[PDB]
Design a binder for this molecule. Sequence first.
Ligand SMILES: [Zn+2]
Ligand SMILES: [Zn+2]
Lengths: 276, 267, 377, 162
Amino acid sequence: RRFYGKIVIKGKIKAVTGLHIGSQANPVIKDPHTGLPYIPGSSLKGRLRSLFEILVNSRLGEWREKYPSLANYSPGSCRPDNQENCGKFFNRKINRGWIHVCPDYETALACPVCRLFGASGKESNFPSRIIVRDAFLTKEWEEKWRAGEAITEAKIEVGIDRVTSQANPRTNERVVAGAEFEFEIIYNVENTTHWRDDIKNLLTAMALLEDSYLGGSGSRGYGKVKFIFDSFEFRPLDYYRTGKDEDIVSIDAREKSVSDILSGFDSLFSEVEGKL
Amino acid sequence: MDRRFYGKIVIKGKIKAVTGLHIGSQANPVIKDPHTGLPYIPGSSLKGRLRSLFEILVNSRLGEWREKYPSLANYSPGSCRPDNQENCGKFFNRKINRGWIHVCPDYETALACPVCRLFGASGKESNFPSRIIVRDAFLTKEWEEKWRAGEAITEAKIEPRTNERVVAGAEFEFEIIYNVENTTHWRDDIKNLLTAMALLEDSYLGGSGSRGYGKVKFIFDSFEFRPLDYYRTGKDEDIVSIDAREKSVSDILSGFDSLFSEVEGKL
Amino acid sequence: MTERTLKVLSPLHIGTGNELTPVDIYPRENIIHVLDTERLVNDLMNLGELNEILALLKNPPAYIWKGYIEEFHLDPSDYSIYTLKIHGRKSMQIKEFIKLNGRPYIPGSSLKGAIRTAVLYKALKECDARAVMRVVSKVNGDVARDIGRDVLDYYMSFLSRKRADDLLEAIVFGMEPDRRSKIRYEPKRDPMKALIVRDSKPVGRKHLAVYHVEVIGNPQPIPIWVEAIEPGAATDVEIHVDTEALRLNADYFNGLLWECLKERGEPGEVFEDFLWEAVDEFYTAVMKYETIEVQKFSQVRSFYASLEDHSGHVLRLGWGSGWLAMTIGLLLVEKGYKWENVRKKLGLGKKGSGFSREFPKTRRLADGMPMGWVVLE
Amino acid sequence: VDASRLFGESPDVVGIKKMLEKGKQWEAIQPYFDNVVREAKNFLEWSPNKRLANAVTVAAYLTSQGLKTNQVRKILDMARTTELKVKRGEGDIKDDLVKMRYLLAYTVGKATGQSKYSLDAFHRILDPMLEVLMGSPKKENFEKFYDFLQAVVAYHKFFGGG
RNA sequence: GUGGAAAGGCGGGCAGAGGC
RNA sequence: CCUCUGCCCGCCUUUCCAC
Ligand SMILES: [Zn+2]
Ligand SMILES: [Zn+2]
């Protein structure tokens, strides 16, 4: 479907405070062979999609011209009226929770949200344009697990009656703070008009996650994840056709998500703008 | 129904352990980072004692605030230890195992509770998410260097038993983030938050405390607003309300809306 | 009130369970010095070994093991206290004071445990006709406290590490539901969980000195070396009662102390006023009791007659406060034979039993001053 | 029972707990290992479970004696801070090993009275190994003591100490 | 011309109460 | 170093298939 190229973003997710992404004495999820923790791709994609739908919901007025089909929603959840595709923004009842998923391919081509994360509706659906891989540990932290150090902790938290001061403690496992991860996000350039927007929106939602939390408790301190990029390479359609290493590389080993979202958006991606 | 976003008021600063500081775990060790072996105040343990003191503040004032914050027509000041109901006319209406806590049972009751809109509610069916997030606060940079060079960061205090305590004078870094989800009531939620911190400077933090293990004292460095425009553009164009030599008993004091005139300028 | 400052009227030793071995000390003058072994040992390497690890473990004839640094080196000390007495032939173990950064402070757990003894004394004075109605609720053992007849006259025969005060703290502070015994303590039921005392500001190096505590009561007196805050040092401490924590617990407190507060008025309002009237009635009563015994040293009585006409609240702390000042047993003097069989039951003298001087024989006073007096106001 | 049930590796780890909770039987059976450990001046001369087997005999040689914990901890809570600086922090802990041997010399010079042969049981066995850390790295040849560090601590609680 | 497309294991919870 | 506490409450699949 008009495939042009794939933009790959590789960076290190870093846990400044102890990450906890559970399973159901409260385990963080683990590889069933190595036993080392990991961050899923369902759990990182959907935390970016979540924080960004709350972002668009506040801006259903300013964005009606840059994004068409955003004038059909009024900001809110369609939870009060148990009908899907009413006039609100959060309009698909998945099971009990209401999520913005656009109803139709020709509207989801014009939403800022459903164009990047995709949508499902009768009479076809829009496949996502990103692939959020699972974020395993880096090899420096395998080789601290090989070295015999800890890699998860067991934290004990208590709830307290405020009048009697009676304590009833519970324990959460969480990954040790400091653990470096390794992510990869593979955008799919299906249109060449909106590829800058979908990358600026993917970096907007990554900047929300650096002041929100990823996974677990977070309001009590479990998030505080930090994104550290390495390199963004755009793979052209001809590169696959031949397998010759002939692809643009935007190199930024030490940059934030706010130092790359607008500081270098046109200064680093200028060579990606050229080749389309 | 209708969760929005406008920005994130970020309160940074530095906690001063004026007296020795003991937040234990399981010869009675204070929790430390497993990686660096150094103590810290958890955000779980700081958000609780900020909520322990504020609910008791609201517990004594349930009559004269039900016109400013409605849905306090549900509550009469008390508890539910006398009779096992999860929800009656009493303020402490959460079983929470053997000790009761105040949690409104729904989104829209907690949307007008001044407590559960700030620290966050929980409920069967609909539930309300928290608006402050409290990171775990570690040691500062200059007390790393005192650990690098052999200055004591801990001490054993024989009480016949030993309560270990983080040695007094030590400082920790604490970051508090408030989520502006509705522009009409952000002023109260910043005032109700600093109200909860003024109570902590008179109460204690962790451990016994009635034997003097508390006297925690905040030292502010920066308020920052961070509007929605900041997330879209990486430029540092956000409001920086410096209060660097101010005290929590002076920011919330008259001197508040002089500090918070520039948050108005974005709305 | 907040920041209720104190002063110090006698030597005051808050122990930390640590002594200074003579390898830590070398007194060049009448002043003494605390050498830094970690820095001095690592500073005496440049001139060179395994000899330091052999000699310090050997502990030969102390003097030469600290004066051997004088050869081609000098001046490695930490705190440099003063001796303030006619002693120190090293042969001593200076007990050290509790310090947070090498700086002496008063711990708040030690000033609360002195108020708790004063408050426990006031509760057993006023509360046997009312002490049964406290244990009438969910205890069922007040009939034994009624048939004996003022729960003290039963507790002398009830007993007839050490958990001797287990029932008496469970009657005056915290009635539990049930146990394998009759009743037990519940920390959740206590008015003293509303009493907040905090660690004081640090005192200072200038007010700290070594002392020479002589034990009197035997024909051969023994000396103990110790360091203590000199009399005349004044620091500031803040004590307050959180009245909001009493209003929430008006139905949950079950003890004789709570039945001393409902008779002075509102029980969540007079607890701070009851608190100091308990202080100046335990500690003035132990102040007058020590004017009976004259076995000390003369000048000791001239200290006790001068403790009067002194404004503020007078109380004991520390290490030299004897068995009379740490214990209910000031009130257990008037029993006599009801406590005489029990004091041998508990035991006392060792190396059988002390007959006529069972409890009060030892007096630990520093330089002719009865040590451990701190006056709040 | 004297040098009959007790053998090299794991014969009497479970049966000697009742005998230590005796006087003349442990005064001669445990004296041979406390001399062989003195003859074990090379610390990493045991890659098998010989250390953990000798840890029971040394803790039985420390069972009938005192071994107060407040003198134990500071020597061994300094042994962790050396290890905490191994984790990409430092590579030369030469200046602290002189202070490490000084704390054991300060310990045997302070505990006077009925605790002489207790702390001299402590002073006997470790000084063959406390010379080894000076001319040796940390990534090997220290960590094997750090296992035998707590090996003697734990069984000493198991035979009835503390 | 892919047993596919869309789908945050999370919301709330002071390791504390007395113990010199 | 002693005395009570040592996980609760939920959703547990929803929706799309052009005769
Ligand atoms: Zn959409
Ligand atoms: Zn509420």
